[PDB]
Amino acid sequence: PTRKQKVEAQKQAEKLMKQIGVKNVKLSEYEMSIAAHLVDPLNMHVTWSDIAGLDDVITDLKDTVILPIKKKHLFENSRLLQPPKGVLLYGPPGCGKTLIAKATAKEAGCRFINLQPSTLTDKWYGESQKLAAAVFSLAIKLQPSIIFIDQIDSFLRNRSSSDHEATAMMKAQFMSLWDGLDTDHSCQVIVMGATNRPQDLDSAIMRRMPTRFHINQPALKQREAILKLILKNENVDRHVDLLEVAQETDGFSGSDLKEMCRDAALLCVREYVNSIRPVQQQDLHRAIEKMKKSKDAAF
Amino acid sequence: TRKQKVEAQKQAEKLMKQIGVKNVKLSEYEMSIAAHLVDPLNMHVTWSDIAGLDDVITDLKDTVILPIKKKHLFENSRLLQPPKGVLLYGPPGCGKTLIAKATAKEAGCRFINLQPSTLTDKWYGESQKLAAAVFSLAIKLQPSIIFIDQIDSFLRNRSSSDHEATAMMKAQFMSLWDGLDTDHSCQVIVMGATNRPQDLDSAIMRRMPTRFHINQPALKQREAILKLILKNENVDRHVDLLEVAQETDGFSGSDLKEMCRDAALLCVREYVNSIRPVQQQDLHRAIEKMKKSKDAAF
Amino acid sequence: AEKLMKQIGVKNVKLSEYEMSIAAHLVDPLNMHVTWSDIAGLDDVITDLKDTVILPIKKKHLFENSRLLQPPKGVLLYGPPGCGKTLIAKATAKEAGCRFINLQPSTLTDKWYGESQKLAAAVFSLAIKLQPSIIFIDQIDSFLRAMMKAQFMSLWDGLDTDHSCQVIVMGATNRPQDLDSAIMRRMPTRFHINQPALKQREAILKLILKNENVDRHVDLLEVAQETDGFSGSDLKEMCRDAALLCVREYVNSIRPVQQQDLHRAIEKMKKSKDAAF
Amino acid sequence: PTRKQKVEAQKQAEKLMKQIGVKNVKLSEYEMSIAAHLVDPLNMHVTWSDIAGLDDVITDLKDTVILPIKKKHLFENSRLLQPPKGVLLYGPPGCGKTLIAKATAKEAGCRFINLQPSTLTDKWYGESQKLAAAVFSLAIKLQPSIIFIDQIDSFLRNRSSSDHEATAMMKAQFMSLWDGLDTDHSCQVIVMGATNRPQDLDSAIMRRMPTRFHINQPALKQREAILKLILKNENVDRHVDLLEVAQETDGFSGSDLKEMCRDAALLCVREYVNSTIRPVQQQDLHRAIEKMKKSKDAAF
Amino acid sequence: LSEYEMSIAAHLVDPLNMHVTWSDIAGLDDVITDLKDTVILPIKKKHLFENSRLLQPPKGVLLYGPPGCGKTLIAKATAKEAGCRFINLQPSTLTDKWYGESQKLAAAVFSLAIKLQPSIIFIDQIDSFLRNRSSSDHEATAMMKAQFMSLWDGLDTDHSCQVIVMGATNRPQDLDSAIMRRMPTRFHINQPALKQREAILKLILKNENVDRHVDLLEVAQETDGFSGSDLKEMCRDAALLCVREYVNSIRPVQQQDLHRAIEKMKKSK
Amino acid sequence: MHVTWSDIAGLDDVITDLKDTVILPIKKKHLFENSRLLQPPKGVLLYGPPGCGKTLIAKATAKEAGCRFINLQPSTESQKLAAAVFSLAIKLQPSIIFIDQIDSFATAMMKAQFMSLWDGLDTDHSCQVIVMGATNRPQDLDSAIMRRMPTRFHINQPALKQREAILKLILKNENVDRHVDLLEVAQETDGFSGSDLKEMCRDAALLCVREYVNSIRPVQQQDLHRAIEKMKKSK
Numbered sequence A: 001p002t003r004k005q006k007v008e009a010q011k012q013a014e015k016l017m018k019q020i021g022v023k024n025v026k027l028s029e030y031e032m033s034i035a036a037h038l039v040d041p042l043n044m045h046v047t048w049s050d051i052a053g054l055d056d057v058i059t060d061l062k063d064t065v066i067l068p069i070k071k072k073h074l075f076e077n078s079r080l081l082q083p084p085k086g087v088l089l090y091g092p093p094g095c096g097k098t099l100i101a102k103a104t105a106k107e108a109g110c111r112f113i114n115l116q117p118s119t120l121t122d123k124w125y126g127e128s129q130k131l132a133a134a135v136f137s138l139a140i141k142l143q144p145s146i147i148f149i150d151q152i153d154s155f156l157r158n159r160s161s162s163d164h165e166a167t168a169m170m171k172a173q174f175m176s177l178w179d180g181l182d183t184d185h186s187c188q189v190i191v192m193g194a195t196n197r198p199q200d201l202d203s204a205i206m207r208r209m210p211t212r213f214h215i216n217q218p219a220l221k222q223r224e225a226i227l228k229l230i231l232k233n234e235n236v237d238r239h240v241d242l243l244e245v246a247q248e249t250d251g252f253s254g255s256d257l258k259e260m261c262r263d264a265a266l267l268c269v270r271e272y273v274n275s276i277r278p279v280q281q282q283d284l285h286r287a288i289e290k291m292k293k294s295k296d297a298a299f
Numbered sequence B: 001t002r003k004q005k006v007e008a009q010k011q012a013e014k015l016m017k018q019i020g021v022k023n024v025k026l027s028e029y030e031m032s033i034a035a036h037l038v039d040p041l042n043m044h045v046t047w048s049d050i051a052g053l054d055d056v057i058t059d060l061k062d063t064v065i066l067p068i069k070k071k072h073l074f075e076n077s078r079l080l081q082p083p084k085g086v087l088l089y090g091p092p093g094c095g096k097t098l099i100a101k102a103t104a105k106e107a108g109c110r111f112i113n114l115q116p117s118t119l120t121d122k123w124y125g126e127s128q129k130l131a132a133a134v135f136s137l138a139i140k141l142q143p144s145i146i147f148i149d150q151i152d153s154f155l156r157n158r159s160s161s162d163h164e165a166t167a168m169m170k171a172q173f174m175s176l177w178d179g180l181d182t183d184h185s186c187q188v189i190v191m192g193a194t195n196r197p198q199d200l201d202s203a204i205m206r207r208m209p210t211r212f213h214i215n216q217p218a219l220k221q222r223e224a225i226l227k228l229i230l231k232n233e234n235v236d237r238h239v240d241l242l243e244v245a246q247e248t249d250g251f252s253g254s255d256l257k258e259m260c261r262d263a264a265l266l267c268v269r270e271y272v273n274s275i276r277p278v279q280q281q282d283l284h285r286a287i288e289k290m291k292k293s294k295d296a297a298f
Numbered sequence C: 001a002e003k004l005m006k007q008i009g010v011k012n013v014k015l016s017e018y019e020m021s022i023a024a025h026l027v028d029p030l031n032m033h034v035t036w037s038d039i040a041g042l043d044d045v046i047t048d049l050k051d052t053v054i055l056p057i058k059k060k061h062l063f064e065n066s067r068l069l070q071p072p073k074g075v076l077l078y079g080p081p082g083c084g085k086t087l088i089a090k091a092t093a094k095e096a097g098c099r100f101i102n103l104q105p106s107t108l109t110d111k112w113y114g115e116s117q118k119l120a121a122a123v124f125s126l127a128i129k130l131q132p133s134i135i136f137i138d139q140i141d142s143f144l145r146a147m148m149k150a151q152f153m154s155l156w157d158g159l160d161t162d163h164s165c166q167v168i169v170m171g172a173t174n175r176p177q178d179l180d181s182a183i184m185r186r187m188p189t190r191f192h193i194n195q196p197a198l199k200q201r202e203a204i205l206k207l208i209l210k211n212e213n214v215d216r217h218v219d220l221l222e223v224a225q226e227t228d229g230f231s232g233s234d235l236k237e238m239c240r241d242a243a244l245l246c247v248r249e250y251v252n253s254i255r256p257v258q259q260q261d262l263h264r265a266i267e268k269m270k271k272s273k274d275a276a277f
Numbered sequence D: 001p002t003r004k005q006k007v008e009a010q011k012q013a014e015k016l017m018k019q020i021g022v023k024n025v026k027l028s029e030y031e032m033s034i035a036a037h038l039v040d041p042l043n044m045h046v047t048w049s050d051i052a053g054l055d056d057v058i059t060d061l062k063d064t065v066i067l068p069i070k071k072k073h074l075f076e077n078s079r080l081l082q083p084p085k086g087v088l089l090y091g092p093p094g095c096g097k098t099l100i101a102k103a104t105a106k107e108a109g110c111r112f113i114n115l116q117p118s119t120l121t122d123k124w125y126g127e128s129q130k131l132a133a134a135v136f137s138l139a140i141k142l143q144p145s146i147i148f149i150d151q152i153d154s155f156l157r158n159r160s161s162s163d164h165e166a167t168a169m170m171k172a173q174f175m176s177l178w179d180g181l182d183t184d185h186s187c188q189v190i191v192m193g194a195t196n197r198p199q200d201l202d203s204a205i206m207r208r209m210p211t212r213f214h215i216n217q218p219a220l221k222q223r224e225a226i227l228k229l230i231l232k233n234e235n236v237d238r239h240v241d242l243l244e245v246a247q248e249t250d251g252f253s254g255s256d257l258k259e260m261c262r263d264a265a266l267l268c269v270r271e272y273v274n275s276t277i278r279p280v281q282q283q284d285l286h287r288a289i290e291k292m293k294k295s296k297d298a299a300f
Numbered sequence E: 001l002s003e004y005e006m007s008i009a010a011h012l013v014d015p016l017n018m019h020v021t022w023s024d025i026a027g028l029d030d031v032i033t034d035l036k037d038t039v040i041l042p043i044k045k046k047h048l049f050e051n052s053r054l055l056q057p058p059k060g061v062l063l064y065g066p067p068g069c070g071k072t073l074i075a076k077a078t079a080k081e082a083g084c085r086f087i088n089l090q091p092s093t094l095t096d097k098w099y100g101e102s103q104k105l106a107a108a109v110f111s112l113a114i115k116l117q118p119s120i121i122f123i124d125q126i127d128s129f130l131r132n133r134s135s136s137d138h139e140a141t142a143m144m145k146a147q148f149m150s151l152w153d154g155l156d157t158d159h160s161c162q163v164i165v166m167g168a169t170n171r172p173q174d175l176d177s178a179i180m181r182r183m184p185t186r187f188h189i190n191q192p193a194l195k196q197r198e199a200i201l202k203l204i205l206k207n208e209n210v211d212r213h214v215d216l217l218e219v220a221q222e223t224d225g226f227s228g229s230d231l232k233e234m235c236r237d238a239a240l241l242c243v244r245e246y247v248n249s250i251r252p253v254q255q256q257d258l259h260r261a262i263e264k265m266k267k268s269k
Numbered sequence F: 001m002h003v004t005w006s007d008i009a010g011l012d013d014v015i016t017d018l019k020d021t022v023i024l025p026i027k028k029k030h031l032f033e034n035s036r037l038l039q040p041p042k043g044v045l046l047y048g049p050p051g052c053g054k055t056l057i058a059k060a061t062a063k064e065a066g067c068r069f070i071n072l073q074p075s076t077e078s079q080k081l082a083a084a085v086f087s088l089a090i091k092l093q094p095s096i097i098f099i100d101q102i103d104s105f106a107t108a109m110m111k112a113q114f115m116s117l118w119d120g121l122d123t124d125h126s127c128q129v130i131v132m133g134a135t136n137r138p139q140d141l142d143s144a145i146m147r148r149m150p151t152r153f154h155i156n157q158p159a160l161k162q163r164e165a166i167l168k169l170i171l172k173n174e175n176v177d178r179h180v181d182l183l184e185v186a187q188e189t190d191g192f193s194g195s196d197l198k199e200m201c202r203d204a205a206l207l208c209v210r211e212y213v214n215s216i217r218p219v220q221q222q223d224l225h226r227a228i229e230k231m232k233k234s235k
């Protein structure tokens, strides 16, 4: 027939499945096309120790998502002790969202799966809803599993009249398979999504993601912590305190400080090549000044 | 060729043996539609598990379940038959899917989930055949309850920016609902749960006249659901569910479940660091956490 | 063909395969318990439809030679959703004297090669073979908003000129504004099936409860003056809910429906009608 | 379906890929349709020497983008020394932006690719997101590469509610594939964009383009530099005071001085042809400046 | 030769059947002088100074002023005296009721213009098409009006193609800030102002009927106050009055019919 | 075309404007061929309300001026057929090419060839090949050749007196009552459209016929009033 571009998902999500260690899974063409976006747990290079600035959020996520997956002998006796069916990572953009997502993909346990909603929308009629169903079918087939939807503020957007029929049907099927009729059993299928704009997400999807973790912008202590974490392996001058830098920033996020340290290292490398030099804490001041002058362009 | 119905024919047979049908001869499309039949014994929720509202439950039981049984009493009257549509509308969360499961389990006749994703097909002239086979199967076994979850997305408001197959299916649904051959003594009822009935339709809205408003829980309903949830789990003796219900004032039927789950998780976390009941102190902390987290939209 | 010949009453069956497949689709006037007495409230529209379409079919001796009385090709019954359209169509299918046939465009779209123009030609060949015939396409808005569409349009425009076959295309419509630009013009006769007014509401309410054991002091005029916006199906649902509420006092352990049950049903229906707002 | 539009670019992207130097790259239909917009390195005829007026920006770009591409032995040990994942060239319209982009399309090494967001949007449903994914797929397939998004203040605009679902999905997928779950690894895939309205670009795309270069309106020294650069190939007299016209303009951008020089040359050719090669004697420049000022005044 | 290219080719005016020269445009003569040496001279005789990098015709010619009085007449005459392939489509031929069918249309237009020799492009009423960029407007034409700028002078442009785009507007104050940049040579088509009116009146009355002696200087200040296009429509009223009077009983014109046409045009206002 | 200019009543001023402008081609030489600006417009268009004598106006303009007419039939390779039709219409001079439903009518190459042929004909001859086939709704009909149709007239409801004249001209064909007058019916029609009076008279005749079929007589004022009331209720 037509649309036979699934001739390489089954040959692409099989060698990728052997890297995870699944023995006997009987899937269809749509299920394999969905599983073609599974992430390898060993392909990540960031653990919980690489995420600084916030500590209570890490422990909360670990005891809400990671803990109920293991120690099943203690959480299966009670009626309501299973992990939630949704984790909404909201807050300002930059620090925390994708890093916590990678930490959950690597060190959390059960098979992680990225959705990438671009593969759900198809050209042919009656093909996007089948893929949306195969998503949850594969999630149920692989217990447990964590369905990750990055930028969930666009795919599962607020419903209105100016929406395509296939996208609206997929958005309805998502909430009809989340906690629908034949769902809500002991399946350990959790759906998480990181988004910087949770104001216009939805009204029916917002309740299906009850555990909402606010990853705020780093404060003074958080900025000091992330500045001390970033300048750990690279050569830095012996007496360089990260408190004055974090106090001087006062508006930098977790990604702007990374750029500031990268700019300082690049300035040191350029000064060395013009003629291995450590950051004498003087380049940090001019880097902060240049970054502030650049950020002042939005106003 | 679309020769996958074979597997849909090997999944709509064993399930049939789980329901107890003896002689029902169907076609390929009818079998593919019946492949979504729900097992009544697979549900684990009855009318006793739905608290907070009682008049709505009694109304639904006397409107849907009561006409199904005692057919000798309603066979003489002309307008004493079950309706052809039940629209469960209201705010999202509490009541809709729970009442759907209760009607699937403890209501009687064979329940069927539509799952409109299977109606839309890639091949031309295949979605309308499945839409017809839906009602064909519904009439084939009487009675039956056709459930369409989130019906405000499949039978949307008819406009010009709609595909030919979807528009044809939406027209065939209302043509086979109360058209030229239906509306006889068939006892085929179609129900649907939705949280946005404002933009559902103009012709489908009248075909579902029995509309049950599953409102958002009030003080009494909040206390009722809080007492129902905290029933089997261990809790302190002097814990008044009225206090937390009056303090909340802003949760639906699903947010209180999350609050109780968070309280139990806090208890089991404080225990696992070194079985502890909730002393009504973790309840307030979970309520404050959920109230400070629900401000993400604003 | 022969499987459904029991009602056409003509031994002129020379149908082919497509004609045979289309012949299994005409309506069954036997199991149609609807006449002009069943439809209430709108009697002027009924008599208009009658003296416009019906006598051109039954009266076949006065106009026989050439006379101007002709069945208008294309009758569009348009209005709000409910209250009359399919009921009038079914009454016509019952007692129009002609072979009524339903379309249901879902059967036209064949999967093989996407060729659905052959069926669009076969349906018209069948309608002309056993004239008079009324081709009814329910929900004609979604069906006509594309080789089959042009072929069917040209067929309907070209074959209905010899005034030898009384084939008439009739359609019901709840959204007449977005129907079409040429189809709306192609149908000369348009019947506006309005929603029941203060008098039509009372008429249909009195017609709904006739054989039931209703109380003596139940003035339907008060119910009509209390509804103020109820459609045809809404009043039937209200009466059904009132009957269920009256029988609820007996099933829990035959009671005549009083005014209190009707008032409670009206209040419940008016509260429920605010779902779309 | 739409396999025709994707069967022509396939016969066009291959030839353009033959002269670039990609040896073995296996692409799909969407990847080939995206690669069909690759720019030829030899077609660009503007280098760093042809861009005057700004000097610190040039060396900053050479150290930030051009330097980490080569000499990989120095930036392979540390954790954060790779080239950035975005270069936002913001400033008033005129000088710098498109010229710097054209210069980097030739004198940067790695394969340059223009996005041309007009080809991303498609008529069929579920086709624009596939092309947006194929963009980054092709970028990762050949390393390194520079994805240029001209006038990025329109495609990756500020997210709101009055936007189409396809453009919103594409805008979300761009930032999801920029620094998402499987793209933070070292891949040398850099995305740059030139725009004249950075105030309403975005809140999540702005952080993904940390290196923000401001191309200001030419000042006195910059105006003198560009006026001396432009009046180098054309025939001019011996003595030309470039500071005079530079101080006279006081409001001309990098493109208005080019127009003034063109108008002076056209006046010279008109005076020559009217009789039947004449060098500008620093008098047609003042008249052209006055005419350009009168034209800019009468525009309102 | 794509599909959108062939769809655009339906608006490509043939360079042979134009029959519009500088003689048809009377009245204003200063704008014609500055446009001949700036647009026609660099386009033609390219074998003289092709070595120079900035001796090419400007790609941003724009003619503003009141509506009418020779706006597109100068464009057609220029394109006829220029190389070939006058290309005007519409102010609203684009913006089809689809998704991704408006920017691709402009892309096809520009590709077709690049395919052949300069092929002067004329965009009638660029004021509303390329209006000032903002964030409150519908976010479907802003991306299009930005792609137009990105394709006008971008990466692949600035070659020896001579592709010159010509615009037209009635109020170039809210047009743009980056589009006016690539439009450096902007001519000012003014109002006739008591002289060009008489000139165009003497021009139009040349190839016509008998037209007995009536000095155009007489009806020069008591004529239509503006809109020379209505002066083109004013002589039409005299012609219809001269051809509609003889049916009651070819007739030569005089001051009476012209004055009555003037009074009728004034009453129309 | 069997239509007559005197039969179609209504806007008498528009009729004279047509019989002057469009029939300047019917006028001999030295009147429209001598002056360059006195020639009639090339490619006249017609737009306005739906129906109301859309094709009837073109038929009357072709019959009164005696100009040759030919049906374009846009519903019935395409570019070649269009070029052949244009050549056939331009050969037999003078001739008018009338099209049906031009508002919704390779097609682009055919339109470009037709526009080029019309431009060449106008540059060669004054009014040899005319084109009058534009339908209603010309605001967004098409954008193929805008300069081809620069002349048009908004044919709408002229006035109540024109409606009364049309009713008197259309009703004076069958048997009518003495007291029943078309002016008395138009005084109560309250601004009915052009095609509305014909359908109202048809409904009155159908009522008068049904009066005998239910039990032939001439139409009366009561039947006309009932038909007008039914048309207003159905309007």
Ligand SMILES: Nc1ncnc2c1ncn2[C@@H]1O[C@H](COP(=O)(O)OP(=O)(O)OP(=O)(O)O)[C@@H](O)[C@H]1O
Binding pocket: A050, A051, A052, A053, A054, A092, A093, A094, A095, A096, A097, A098, A099, A151, A194, A195, A196, A226, A229, A254, A255, A258, D175, D179, D180, D184, D204, D205
């Ligand atoms: N706690 C942290 N420890 C180390 N690095 C951090 C931390 N927080 C942020 N970062 C830096 O931020 C970058 C990741 O940003 P990320 O991808 O999470 O943005 P995002 O929040 O996903 O963007 P958006 O809000 O648009 O989705 C990494 O390069 C990392 O160096």
Ligand SMILES: Nc1ncnc2c1ncn2[C@@H]1O[C@H](COP(=O)(O)OP(=O)(O)OP(=O)(O)O)[C@@H](O)[C@H]1O
Binding pocket: A175, A179, A180, A184, A204, A205, B049, B050, B051, B052, B053, B091, B092, B093, B094, B095, B096, B097, B098, B150, B194, B195, B225, B228, B253, B254, B257
């Ligand atoms: N009366 C009740 N008794 C017990 N639990 C309840 C009650 N009402 C709601 N719940 C809780 O709500 C959850 C079910 O939510 P449900 O699936 O009905 O949401 P929904 O209304 O279907 O959402 P949407 O409106 O988006 O379709 C269950 O987990 C259940 O614990």
Ligand SMILES: Nc1ncnc2c1ncn2[C@@H]1O[C@H](COP(=O)(O)OP(=O)(O)OP(=O)(O)O)[C@@H](O)[C@H]1O
Binding pocket: B174, B178, B183, B203, C038, C039, C040, C041, C042, C080, C081, C082, C083, C084, C085, C086, C087, C139, C172, C173, C174, C204, C207, C208, C232, C233, C236
């Ligand atoms: N005049 C009437 N008298 C009695 N019952 C009526 C009348 N009109 C409508 N009904 C009731 O309405 C129901 C039929 O609805 P109806 O056929 O009018 O809907 P419809 O207009 O065909 O729907 P759609 O607009 O989708 O075609 C019947 O069950 C009948 O009981």
Ligand SMILES: Nc1ncnc2c1ncn2[C@@H]1O[C@H](COP(=O)(O)OP(=O)(O)OP(=O)(O)O)[C@@H](O)[C@H]1O
Binding pocket: D050, D051, D052, D053, D054, D092, D093, D094, D095, D096, D097, D098, D099, D195, D196, D226, D229, D254, D255, D258, E149, E153, E154, E178, E179
């Ligand atoms: N430093 C320079 N050296 C030489 N030429 C220059 C310089 N700066 C600007 N120019 C001139 O400017 C023109 C390029 O303008 P460009 O396309 O960069 O405008 P832009 O800023 O991209 O416009 P927009 O902001 O609308 O995208 C070239 O023709 C070039 O001659």
Ligand SMILES: Nc1ncnc2c1ncn2[C@@H]1O[C@H](COP(=O)(O)OP(=O)(O)OP(=O)(O)O)[C@@H](O)[C@H]1O
Binding pocket: E024, E025, E026, E027, E028, E066, E067, E068, E069, E070, E071, E072, E073, E124, E196, E200, E228, E229, E232
């Ligand atoms: N000075 C003039 N000399 C000769 N003809 C003129 C003159 N001014 C106007 N006309 C005539 O008036 C007509 C319309 O004038 P013009 O082309 O200036 O309008 P326009 O502003 O281009 O209209 P639009 O804005 O719709 O494009 C032309 O056909 C032209 O023949």
Ligand SMILES: [Mg+2]
Binding pocket: A097, A098, A150, A194, D175, D176, D179, D180
């Ligand atoms: Mg992210």
Ligand SMILES: [Mg+2]
Binding pocket: A175, A176, A179, A180, B096, B097, B149, B150, B193
């Ligand atoms: Mg639900």
Ligand SMILES: [Mg+2]
Binding pocket: B174, B178, B179, C085, C086, C138, C172
């Ligand atoms: Mg109906």
Ligand SMILES: [Mg+2]
Binding pocket: D097, D098, E149, E150, E153, E154
């Ligand atoms: Mg630019």
